[PDB]
PDB file of C-alpha atoms in Angstrom:
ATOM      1  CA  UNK A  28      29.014 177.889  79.830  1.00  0.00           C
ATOM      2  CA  UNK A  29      31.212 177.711  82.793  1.00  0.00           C
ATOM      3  CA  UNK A  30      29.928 175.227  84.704  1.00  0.00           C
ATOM      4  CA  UNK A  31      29.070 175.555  88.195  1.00  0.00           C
ATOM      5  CA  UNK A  32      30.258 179.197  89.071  1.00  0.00           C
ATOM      6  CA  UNK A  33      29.970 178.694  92.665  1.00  0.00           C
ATOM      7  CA  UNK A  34      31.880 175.171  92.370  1.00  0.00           C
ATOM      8  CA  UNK A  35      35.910 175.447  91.891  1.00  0.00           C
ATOM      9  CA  UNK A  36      36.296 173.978  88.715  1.00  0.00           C
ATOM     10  CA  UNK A  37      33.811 176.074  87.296  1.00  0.00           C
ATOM     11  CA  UNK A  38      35.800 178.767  88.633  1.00  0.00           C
ATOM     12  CA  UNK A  39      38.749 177.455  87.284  1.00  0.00           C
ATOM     13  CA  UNK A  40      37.022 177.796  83.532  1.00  0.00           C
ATOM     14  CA  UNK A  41      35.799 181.208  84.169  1.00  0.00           C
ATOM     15  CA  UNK A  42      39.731 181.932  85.051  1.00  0.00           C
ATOM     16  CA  UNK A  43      40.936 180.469  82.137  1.00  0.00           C
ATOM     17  CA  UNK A  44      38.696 182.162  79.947  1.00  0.00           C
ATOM     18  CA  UNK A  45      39.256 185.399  81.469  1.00  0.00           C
ATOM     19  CA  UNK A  46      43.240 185.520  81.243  1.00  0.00           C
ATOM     20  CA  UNK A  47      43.350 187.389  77.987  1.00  0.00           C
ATOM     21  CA  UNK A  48      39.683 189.422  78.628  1.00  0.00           C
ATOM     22  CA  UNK A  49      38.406 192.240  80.874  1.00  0.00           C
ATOM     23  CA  UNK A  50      34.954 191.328  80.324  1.00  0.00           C
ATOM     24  CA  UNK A  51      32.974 188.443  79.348  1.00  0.00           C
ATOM     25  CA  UNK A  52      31.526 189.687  76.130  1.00  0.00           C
ATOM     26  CA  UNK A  53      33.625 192.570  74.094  1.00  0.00           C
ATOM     27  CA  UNK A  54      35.579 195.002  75.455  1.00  0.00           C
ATOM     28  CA  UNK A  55      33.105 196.933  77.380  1.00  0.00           C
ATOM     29  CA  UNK A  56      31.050 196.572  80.769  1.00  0.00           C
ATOM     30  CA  UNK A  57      27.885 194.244  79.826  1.00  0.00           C
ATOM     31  CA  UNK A  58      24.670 192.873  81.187  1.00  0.00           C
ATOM     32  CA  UNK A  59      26.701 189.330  80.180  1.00  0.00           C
ATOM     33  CA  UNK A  60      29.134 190.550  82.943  1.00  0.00           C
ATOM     34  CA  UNK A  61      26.212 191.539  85.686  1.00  0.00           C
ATOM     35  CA  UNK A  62      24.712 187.663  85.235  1.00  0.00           C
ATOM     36  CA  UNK A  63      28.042 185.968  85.357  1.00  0.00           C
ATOM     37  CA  UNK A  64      29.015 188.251  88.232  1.00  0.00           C
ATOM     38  CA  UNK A  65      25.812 187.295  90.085  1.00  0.00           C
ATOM     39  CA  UNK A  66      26.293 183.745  89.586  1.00  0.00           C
ATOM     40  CA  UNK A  67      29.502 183.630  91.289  1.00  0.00           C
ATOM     41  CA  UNK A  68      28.255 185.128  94.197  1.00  0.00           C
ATOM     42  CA  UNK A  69      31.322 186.225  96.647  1.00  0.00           C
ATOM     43  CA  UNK A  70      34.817 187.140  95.281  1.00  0.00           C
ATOM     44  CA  UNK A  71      37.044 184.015  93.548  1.00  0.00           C
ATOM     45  CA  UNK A  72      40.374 183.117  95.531  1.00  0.00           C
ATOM     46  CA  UNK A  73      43.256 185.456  94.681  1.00  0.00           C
ATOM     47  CA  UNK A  74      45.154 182.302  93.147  1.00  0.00           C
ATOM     48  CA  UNK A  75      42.193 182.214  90.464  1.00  0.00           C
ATOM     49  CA  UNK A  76      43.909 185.879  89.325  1.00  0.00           C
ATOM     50  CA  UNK A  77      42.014 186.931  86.542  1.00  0.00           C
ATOM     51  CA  UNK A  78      38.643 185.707  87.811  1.00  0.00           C
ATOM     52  CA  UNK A  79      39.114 188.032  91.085  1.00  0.00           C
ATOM     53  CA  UNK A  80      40.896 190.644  89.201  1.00  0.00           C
ATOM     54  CA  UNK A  81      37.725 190.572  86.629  1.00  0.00           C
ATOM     55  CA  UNK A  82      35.134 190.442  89.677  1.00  0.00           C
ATOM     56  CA  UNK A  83      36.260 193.640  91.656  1.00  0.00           C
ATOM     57  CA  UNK A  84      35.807 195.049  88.161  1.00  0.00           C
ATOM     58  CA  UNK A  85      32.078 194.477  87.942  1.00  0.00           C
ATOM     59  CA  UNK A  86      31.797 195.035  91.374  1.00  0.00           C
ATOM     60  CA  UNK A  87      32.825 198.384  90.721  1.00  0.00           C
ATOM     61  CA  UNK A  88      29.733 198.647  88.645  1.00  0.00           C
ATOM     62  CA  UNK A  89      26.729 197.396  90.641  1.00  0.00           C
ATOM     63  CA  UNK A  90      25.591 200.356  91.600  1.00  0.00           C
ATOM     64  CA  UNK A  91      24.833 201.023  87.939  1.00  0.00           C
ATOM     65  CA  UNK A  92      24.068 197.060  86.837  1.00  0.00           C
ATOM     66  CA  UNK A  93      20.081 197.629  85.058  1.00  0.00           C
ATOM     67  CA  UNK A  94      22.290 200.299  82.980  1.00  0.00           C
ATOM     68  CA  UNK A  95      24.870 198.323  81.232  1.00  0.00           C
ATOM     69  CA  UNK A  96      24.079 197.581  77.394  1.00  0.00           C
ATOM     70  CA  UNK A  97      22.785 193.963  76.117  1.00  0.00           C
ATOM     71  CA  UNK A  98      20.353 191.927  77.904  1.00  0.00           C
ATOM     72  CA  UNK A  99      20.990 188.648  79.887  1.00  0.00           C
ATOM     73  CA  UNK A 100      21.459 185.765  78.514  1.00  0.00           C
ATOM     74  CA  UNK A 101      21.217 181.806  80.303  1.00  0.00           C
ATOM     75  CA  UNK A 102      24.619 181.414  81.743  1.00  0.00           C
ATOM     76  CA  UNK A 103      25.553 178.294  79.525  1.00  0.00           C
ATOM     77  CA  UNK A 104      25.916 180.585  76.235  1.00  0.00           C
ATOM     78  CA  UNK A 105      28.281 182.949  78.346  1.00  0.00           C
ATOM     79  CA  UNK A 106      32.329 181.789  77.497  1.00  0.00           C
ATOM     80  CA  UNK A 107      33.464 179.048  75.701  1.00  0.00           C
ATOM     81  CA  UNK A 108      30.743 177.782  73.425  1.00  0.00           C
ATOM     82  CA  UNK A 109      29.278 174.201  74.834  1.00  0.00           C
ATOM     83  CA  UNK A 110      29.647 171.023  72.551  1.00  0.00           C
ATOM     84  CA  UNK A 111      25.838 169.959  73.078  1.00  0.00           C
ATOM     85  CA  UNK A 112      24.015 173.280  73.651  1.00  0.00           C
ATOM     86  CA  UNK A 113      20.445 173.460  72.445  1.00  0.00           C
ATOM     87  CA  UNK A 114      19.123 176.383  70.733  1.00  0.00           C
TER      88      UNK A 114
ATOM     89  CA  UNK B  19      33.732 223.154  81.311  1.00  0.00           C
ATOM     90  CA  UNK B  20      35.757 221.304  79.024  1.00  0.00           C
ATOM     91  CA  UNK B  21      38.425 222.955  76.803  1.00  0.00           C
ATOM     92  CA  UNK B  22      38.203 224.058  73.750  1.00  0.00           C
ATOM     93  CA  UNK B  23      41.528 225.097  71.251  1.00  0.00           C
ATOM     94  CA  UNK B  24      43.685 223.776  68.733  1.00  0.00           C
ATOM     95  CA  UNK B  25      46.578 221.228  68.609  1.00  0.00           C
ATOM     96  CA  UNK B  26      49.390 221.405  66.433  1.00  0.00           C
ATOM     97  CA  UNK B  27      50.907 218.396  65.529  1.00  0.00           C
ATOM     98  CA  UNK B  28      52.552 216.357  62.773  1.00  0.00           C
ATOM     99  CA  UNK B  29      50.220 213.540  61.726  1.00  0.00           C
ATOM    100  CA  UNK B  30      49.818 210.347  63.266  1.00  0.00           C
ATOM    101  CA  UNK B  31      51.705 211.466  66.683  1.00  0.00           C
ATOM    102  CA  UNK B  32      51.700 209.349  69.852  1.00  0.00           C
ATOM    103  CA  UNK B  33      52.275 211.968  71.680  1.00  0.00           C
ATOM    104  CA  UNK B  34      48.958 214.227  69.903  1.00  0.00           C
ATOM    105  CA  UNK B  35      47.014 210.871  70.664  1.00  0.00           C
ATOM    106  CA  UNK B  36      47.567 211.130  74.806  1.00  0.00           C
ATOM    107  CA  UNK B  37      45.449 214.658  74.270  1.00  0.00           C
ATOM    108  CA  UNK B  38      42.911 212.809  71.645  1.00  0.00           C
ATOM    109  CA  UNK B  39      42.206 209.899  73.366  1.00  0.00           C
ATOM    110  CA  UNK B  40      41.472 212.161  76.607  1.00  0.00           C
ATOM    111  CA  UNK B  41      39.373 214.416  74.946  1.00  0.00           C
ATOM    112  CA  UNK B  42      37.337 211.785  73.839  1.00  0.00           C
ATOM    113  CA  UNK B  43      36.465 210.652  77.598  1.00  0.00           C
ATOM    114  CA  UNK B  44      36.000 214.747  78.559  1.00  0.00           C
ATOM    115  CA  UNK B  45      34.372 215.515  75.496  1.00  0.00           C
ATOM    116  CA  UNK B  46      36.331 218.373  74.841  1.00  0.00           C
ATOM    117  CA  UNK B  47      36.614 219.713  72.211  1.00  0.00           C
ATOM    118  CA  UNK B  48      40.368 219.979  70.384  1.00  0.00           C
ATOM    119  CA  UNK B  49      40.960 220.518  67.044  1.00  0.00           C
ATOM    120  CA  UNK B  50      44.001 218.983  65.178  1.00  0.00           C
ATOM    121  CA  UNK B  51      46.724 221.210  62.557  1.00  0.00           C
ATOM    122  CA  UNK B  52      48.499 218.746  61.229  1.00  0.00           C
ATOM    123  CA  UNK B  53      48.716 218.979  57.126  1.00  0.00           C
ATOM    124  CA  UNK B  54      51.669 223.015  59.201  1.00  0.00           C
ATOM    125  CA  UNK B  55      55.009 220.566  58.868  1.00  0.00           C
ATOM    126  CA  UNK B  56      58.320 222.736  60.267  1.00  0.00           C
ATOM    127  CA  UNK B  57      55.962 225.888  61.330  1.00  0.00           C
ATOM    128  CA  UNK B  58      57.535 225.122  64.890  1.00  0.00           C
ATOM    129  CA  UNK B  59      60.282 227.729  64.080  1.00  0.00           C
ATOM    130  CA  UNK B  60      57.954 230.421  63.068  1.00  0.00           C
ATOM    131  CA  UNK B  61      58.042 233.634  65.678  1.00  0.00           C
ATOM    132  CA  UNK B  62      54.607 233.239  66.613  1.00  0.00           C
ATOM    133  CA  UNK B  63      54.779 229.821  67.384  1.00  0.00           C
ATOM    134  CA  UNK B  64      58.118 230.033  69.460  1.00  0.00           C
ATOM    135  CA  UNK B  65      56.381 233.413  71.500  1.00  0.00           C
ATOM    136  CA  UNK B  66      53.903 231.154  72.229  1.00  0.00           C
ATOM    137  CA  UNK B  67      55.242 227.706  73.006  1.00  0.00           C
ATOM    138  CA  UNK B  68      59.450 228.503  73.455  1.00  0.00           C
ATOM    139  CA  UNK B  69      60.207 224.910  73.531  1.00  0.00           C
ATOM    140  CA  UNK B  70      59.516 224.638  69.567  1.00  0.00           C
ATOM    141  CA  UNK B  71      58.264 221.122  70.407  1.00  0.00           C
ATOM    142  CA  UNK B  72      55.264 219.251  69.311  1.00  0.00           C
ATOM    143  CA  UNK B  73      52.186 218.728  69.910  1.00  0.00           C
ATOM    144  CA  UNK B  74      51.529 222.455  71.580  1.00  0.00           C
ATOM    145  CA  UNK B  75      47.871 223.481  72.653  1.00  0.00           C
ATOM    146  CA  UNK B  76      46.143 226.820  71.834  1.00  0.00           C
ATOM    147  CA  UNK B  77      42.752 227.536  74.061  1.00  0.00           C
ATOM    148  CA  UNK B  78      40.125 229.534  72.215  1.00  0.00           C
ATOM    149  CA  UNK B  79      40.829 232.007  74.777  1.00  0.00           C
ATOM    150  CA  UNK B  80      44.391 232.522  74.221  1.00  0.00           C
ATOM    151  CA  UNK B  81      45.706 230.026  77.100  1.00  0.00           C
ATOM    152  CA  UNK B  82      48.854 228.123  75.636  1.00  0.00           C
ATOM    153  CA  UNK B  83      50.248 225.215  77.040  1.00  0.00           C
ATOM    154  CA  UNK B  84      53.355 223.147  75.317  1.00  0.00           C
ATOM    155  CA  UNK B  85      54.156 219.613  76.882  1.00  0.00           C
ATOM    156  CA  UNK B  86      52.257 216.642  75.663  1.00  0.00           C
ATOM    157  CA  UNK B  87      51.387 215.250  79.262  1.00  0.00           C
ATOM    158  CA  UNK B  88      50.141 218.718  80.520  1.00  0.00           C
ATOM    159  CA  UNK B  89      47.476 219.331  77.229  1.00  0.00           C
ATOM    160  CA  UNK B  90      46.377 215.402  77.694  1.00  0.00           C
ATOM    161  CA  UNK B  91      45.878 216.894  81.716  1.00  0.00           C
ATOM    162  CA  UNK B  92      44.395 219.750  80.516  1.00  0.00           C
ATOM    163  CA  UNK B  93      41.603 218.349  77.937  1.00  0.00           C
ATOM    164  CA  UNK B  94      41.011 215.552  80.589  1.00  0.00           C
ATOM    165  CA  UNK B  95      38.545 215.808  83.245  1.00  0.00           C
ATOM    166  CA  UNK B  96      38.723 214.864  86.898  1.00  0.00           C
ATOM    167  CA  UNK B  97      37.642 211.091  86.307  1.00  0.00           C
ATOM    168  CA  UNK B  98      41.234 211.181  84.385  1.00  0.00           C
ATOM    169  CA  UNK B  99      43.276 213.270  86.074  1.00  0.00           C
ATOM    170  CA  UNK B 100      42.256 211.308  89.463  1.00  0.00           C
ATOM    171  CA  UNK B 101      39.411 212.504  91.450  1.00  0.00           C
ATOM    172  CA  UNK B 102      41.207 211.800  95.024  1.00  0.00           C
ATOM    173  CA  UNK B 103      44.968 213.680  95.622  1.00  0.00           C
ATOM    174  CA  UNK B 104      45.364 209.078  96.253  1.00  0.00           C
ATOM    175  CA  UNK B 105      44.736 208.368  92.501  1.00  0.00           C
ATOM    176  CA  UNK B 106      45.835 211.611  90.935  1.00  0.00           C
ATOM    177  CA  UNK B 107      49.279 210.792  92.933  1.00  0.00           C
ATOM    178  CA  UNK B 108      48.706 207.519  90.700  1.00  0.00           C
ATOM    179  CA  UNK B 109      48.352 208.945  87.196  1.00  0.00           C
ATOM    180  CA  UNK B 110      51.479 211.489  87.770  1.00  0.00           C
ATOM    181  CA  UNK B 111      52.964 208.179  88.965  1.00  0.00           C
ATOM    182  CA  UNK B 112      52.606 206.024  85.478  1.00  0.00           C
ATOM    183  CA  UNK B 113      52.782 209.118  83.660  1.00  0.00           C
ATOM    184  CA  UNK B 114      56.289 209.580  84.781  1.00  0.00           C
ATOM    185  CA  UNK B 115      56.895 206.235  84.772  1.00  0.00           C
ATOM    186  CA  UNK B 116      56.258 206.548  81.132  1.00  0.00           C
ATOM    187  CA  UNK B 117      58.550 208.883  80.387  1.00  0.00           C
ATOM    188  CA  UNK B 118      61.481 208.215  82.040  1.00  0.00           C
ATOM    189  CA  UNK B 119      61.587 204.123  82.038  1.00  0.00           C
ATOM    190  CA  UNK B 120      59.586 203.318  78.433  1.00  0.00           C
ATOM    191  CA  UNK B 121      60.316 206.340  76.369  1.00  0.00           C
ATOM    192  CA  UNK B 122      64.167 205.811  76.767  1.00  0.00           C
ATOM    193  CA  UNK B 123      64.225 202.083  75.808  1.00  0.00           C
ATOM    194  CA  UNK B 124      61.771 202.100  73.524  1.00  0.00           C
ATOM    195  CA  UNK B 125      63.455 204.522  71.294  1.00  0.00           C
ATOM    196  CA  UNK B 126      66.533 202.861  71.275  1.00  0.00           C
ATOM    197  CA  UNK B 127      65.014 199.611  70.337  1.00  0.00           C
ATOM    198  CA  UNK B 128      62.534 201.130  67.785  1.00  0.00           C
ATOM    199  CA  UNK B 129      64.079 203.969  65.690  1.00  0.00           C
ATOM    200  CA  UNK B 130      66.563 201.245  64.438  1.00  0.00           C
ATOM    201  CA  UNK B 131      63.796 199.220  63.053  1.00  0.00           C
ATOM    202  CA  UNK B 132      62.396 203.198  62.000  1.00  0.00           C
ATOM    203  CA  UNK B 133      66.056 203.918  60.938  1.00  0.00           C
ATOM    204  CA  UNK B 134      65.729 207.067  63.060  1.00  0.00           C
ATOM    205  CA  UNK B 135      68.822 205.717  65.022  1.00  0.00           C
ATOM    206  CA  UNK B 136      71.770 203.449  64.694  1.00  0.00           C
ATOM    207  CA  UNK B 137      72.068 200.709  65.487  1.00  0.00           C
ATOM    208  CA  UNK B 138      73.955 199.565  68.424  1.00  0.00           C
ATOM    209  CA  UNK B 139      73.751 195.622  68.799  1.00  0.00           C
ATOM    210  CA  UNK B 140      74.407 195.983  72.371  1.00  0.00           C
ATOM    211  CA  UNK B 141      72.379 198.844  73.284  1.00  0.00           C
ATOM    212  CA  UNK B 142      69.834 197.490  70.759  1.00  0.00           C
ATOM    213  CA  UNK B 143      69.573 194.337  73.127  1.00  0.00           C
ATOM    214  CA  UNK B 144      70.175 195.959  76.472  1.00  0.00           C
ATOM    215  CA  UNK B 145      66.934 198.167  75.176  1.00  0.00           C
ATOM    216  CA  UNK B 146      65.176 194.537  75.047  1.00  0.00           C
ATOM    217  CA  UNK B 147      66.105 193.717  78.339  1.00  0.00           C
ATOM    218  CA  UNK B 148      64.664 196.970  79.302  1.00  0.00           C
ATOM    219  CA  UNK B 149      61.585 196.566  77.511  1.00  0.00           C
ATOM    220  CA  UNK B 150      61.146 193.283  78.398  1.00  0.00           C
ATOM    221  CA  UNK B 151      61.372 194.310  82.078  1.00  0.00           C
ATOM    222  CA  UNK B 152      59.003 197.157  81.708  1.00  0.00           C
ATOM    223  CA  UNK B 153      55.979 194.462  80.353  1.00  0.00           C
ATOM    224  CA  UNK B 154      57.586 192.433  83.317  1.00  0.00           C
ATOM    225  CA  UNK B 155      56.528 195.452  85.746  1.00  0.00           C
ATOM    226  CA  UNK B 156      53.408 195.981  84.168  1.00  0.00           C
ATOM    227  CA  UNK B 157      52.104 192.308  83.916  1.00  0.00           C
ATOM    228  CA  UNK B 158      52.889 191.821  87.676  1.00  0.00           C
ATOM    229  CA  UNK B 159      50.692 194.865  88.432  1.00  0.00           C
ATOM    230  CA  UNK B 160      47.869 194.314  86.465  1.00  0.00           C
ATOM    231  CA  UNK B 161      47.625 190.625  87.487  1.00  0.00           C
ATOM    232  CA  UNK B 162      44.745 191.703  89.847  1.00  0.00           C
ATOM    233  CA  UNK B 163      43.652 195.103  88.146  1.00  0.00           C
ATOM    234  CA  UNK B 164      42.136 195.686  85.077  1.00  0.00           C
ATOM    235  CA  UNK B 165      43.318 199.194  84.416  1.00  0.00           C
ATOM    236  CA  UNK B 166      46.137 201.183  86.102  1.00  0.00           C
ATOM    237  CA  UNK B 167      44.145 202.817  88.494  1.00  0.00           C
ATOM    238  CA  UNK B 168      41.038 202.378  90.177  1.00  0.00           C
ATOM    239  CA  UNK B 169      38.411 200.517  87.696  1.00  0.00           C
ATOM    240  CA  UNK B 170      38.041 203.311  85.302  1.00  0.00           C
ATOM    241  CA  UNK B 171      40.421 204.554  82.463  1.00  0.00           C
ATOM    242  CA  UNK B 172      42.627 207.310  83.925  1.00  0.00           C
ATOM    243  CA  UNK B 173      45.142 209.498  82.075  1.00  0.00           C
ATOM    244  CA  UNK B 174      48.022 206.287  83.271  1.00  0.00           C
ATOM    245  CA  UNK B 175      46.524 203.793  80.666  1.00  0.00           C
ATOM    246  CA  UNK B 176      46.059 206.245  78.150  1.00  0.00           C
ATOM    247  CA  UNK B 177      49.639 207.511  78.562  1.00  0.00           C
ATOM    248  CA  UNK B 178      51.228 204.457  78.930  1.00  0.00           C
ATOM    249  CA  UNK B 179      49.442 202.681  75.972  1.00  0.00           C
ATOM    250  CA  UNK B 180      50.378 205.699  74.034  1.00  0.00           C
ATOM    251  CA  UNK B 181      54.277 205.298  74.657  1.00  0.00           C
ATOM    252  CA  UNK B 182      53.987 201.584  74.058  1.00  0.00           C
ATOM    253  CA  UNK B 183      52.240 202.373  70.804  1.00  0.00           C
ATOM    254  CA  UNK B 184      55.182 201.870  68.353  1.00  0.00           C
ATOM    255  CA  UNK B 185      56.835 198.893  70.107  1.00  0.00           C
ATOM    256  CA  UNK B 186      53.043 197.034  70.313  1.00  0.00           C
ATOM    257  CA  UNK B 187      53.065 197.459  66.404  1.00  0.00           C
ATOM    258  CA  UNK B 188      56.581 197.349  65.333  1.00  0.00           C
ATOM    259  CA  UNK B 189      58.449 195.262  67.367  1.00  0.00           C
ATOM    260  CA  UNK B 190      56.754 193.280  70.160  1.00  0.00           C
ATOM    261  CA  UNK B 191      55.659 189.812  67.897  1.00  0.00           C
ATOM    262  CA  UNK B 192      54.149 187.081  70.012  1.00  0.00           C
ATOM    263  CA  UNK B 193      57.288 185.218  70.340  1.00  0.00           C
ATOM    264  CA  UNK B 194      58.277 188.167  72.485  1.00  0.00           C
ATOM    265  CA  UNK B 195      55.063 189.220  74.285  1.00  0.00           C
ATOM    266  CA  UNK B 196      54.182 185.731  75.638  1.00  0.00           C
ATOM    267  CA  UNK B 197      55.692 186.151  78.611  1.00  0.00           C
ATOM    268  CA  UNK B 198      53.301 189.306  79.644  1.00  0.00           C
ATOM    269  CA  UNK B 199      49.828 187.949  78.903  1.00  0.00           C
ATOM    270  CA  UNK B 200      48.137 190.411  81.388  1.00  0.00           C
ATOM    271  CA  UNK B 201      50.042 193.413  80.077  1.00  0.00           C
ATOM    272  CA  UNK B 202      48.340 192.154  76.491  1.00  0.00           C
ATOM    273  CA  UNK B 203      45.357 191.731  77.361  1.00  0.00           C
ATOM    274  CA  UNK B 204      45.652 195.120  79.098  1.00  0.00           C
ATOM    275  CA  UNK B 205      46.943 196.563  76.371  1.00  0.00           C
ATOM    276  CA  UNK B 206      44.073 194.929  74.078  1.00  0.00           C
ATOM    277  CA  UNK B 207      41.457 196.332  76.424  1.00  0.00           C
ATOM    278  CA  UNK B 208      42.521 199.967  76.186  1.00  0.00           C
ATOM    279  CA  UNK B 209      42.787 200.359  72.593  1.00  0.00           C
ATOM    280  CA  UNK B 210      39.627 198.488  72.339  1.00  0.00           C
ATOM    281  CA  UNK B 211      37.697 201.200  74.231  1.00  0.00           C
ATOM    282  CA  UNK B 212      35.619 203.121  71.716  1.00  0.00           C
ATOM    283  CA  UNK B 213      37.362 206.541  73.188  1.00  0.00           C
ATOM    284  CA  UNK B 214      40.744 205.149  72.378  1.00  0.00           C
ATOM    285  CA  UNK B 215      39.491 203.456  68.884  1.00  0.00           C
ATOM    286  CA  UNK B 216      38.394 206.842  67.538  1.00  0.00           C
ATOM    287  CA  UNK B 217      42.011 208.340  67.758  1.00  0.00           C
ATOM    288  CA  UNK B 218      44.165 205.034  67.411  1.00  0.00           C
ATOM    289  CA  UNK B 219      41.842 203.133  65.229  1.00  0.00           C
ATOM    290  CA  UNK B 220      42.451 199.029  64.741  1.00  0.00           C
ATOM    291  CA  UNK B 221      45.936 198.425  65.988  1.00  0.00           C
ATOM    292  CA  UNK B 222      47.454 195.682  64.609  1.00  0.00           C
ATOM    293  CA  UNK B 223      50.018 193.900  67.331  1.00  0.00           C
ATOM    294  CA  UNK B 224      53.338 192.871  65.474  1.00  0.00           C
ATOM    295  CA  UNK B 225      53.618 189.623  63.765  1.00  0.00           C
ATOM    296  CA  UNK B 226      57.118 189.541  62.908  1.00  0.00           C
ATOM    297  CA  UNK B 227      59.794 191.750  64.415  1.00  0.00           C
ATOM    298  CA  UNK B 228      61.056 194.296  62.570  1.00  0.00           C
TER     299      UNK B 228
END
């Protein structure tokens, strides 16, 4: 998991994690991307690059979220893999 | 709808695969005469495409076109060629781009390695510089976009990732490519996409300059 998406540092993790992706899982749009992207609520500051350059992305998509591929997953097994995660 | 025709080409051209890869997003349908070789310089061939340059494009209904940017345009559709006069000003833009700031460069840095050239250790390294300003360009731009323009694929990524083929494989090892992690990851993206996989297939980034 991130974090907190709506907290800074959480945002800071999504940014990270995003520098060398497009999406959040693959190379393609996903439903990972339409939870993520809902969890974060209103667009990252610029300085957090990737995470706003990655946001306007999805937002390009919304009209056509329920279509993307996969199915949504809780938001901690979304980026890098938690220590402690149960399941 | 879509075109349909053949495209002559020796195998395994970058310049065949800005055509493929576009197809493959328009669906049309081109086939590939490859296996052909120095059949350039036949009369029929130059009455239909003068230039004698490769690839060349043969419609099923006779139309002939001869440049590699203008079949890729032509087997495209408008989601590629840029649905506004805004972003089809865009593709022509990086398409351009393409040809006259990478292609030039490029070469001189990469036939050496190819033995195409010679080897000039000046030129060789000004050709760096070059280069190495070009990923500068590009990493600076695509620090807030995912692809060149709009959100969707447009003939720009597919022709630029196309001319940076050879140096992506060849040439640009990580030492080298460090500097430009959002023209990599860029770069990454595109070939990833199941349109461009089909043509380019896995594309192994260079691990040690050659």
């Amino acid at each position: 998991g991130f974090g907190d998406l709506k907290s800074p540092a959480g945002l800071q993790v999504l940014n990270d994690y995003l520098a060398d992706k497009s999406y959040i899982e693959g190379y393609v749009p996903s439903q990972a991307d339409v939870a993520v992207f809902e969890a974060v609520s209103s667009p990252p500051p610029a300085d957090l690059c990737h995470a706003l350059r990655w946001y306007n992305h999805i937002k390009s998509y919304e009209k056509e979220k329920a279509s993307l591929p996969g199915v949504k997953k809780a938001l901690g097994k979304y980026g890098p893999a938690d220590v402690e995660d149960t399941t | 709808a879509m075109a349909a025709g053949t495209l002559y080409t020796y195998p395994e051209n970058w310049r065949a695969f800005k055509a493929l890869i576009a197809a493959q997003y328009s669906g049309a349908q081109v086939r590939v005469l490859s296996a052909f070789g120095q059949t350039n310089r036949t009369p029929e061939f130059l009455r239909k495409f003068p230039a004698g340059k490769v690839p060349a494009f043969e419609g099923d209904d006779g139309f002939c076109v001869f440049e590699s940017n203008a079949i890729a345009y032509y087997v495209s559709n408008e989601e590629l060629r840029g649905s506004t006069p805004e972003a089809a000003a865009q593709v022509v833009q990086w398409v351009s781009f393409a040809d006259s700031d990478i292609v030039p460069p490029a070469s001189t840095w990469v036939f050496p390695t190819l033995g195409i050239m010679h080897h000039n250790k000046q030129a060789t390294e000004n050709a760096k510089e070059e280069v190495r300003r070009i990923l500068g360009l590009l990493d600076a731009y695509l620090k807030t976009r995912t692809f060149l323009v709009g959100e969707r694929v447009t003939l720009a990524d597919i022709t630029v990732v196309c001319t940076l083929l050879w140096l992506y494989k060849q040439v640009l090892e990580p030492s080298f490519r460090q500097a430009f992690p959002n023209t990599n990851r860029w770069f990454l993206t595109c070939i990833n996409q199941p349109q461009f996989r089909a043509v380019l297939g896995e594309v192994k980034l260079c691990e040690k300059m050659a």
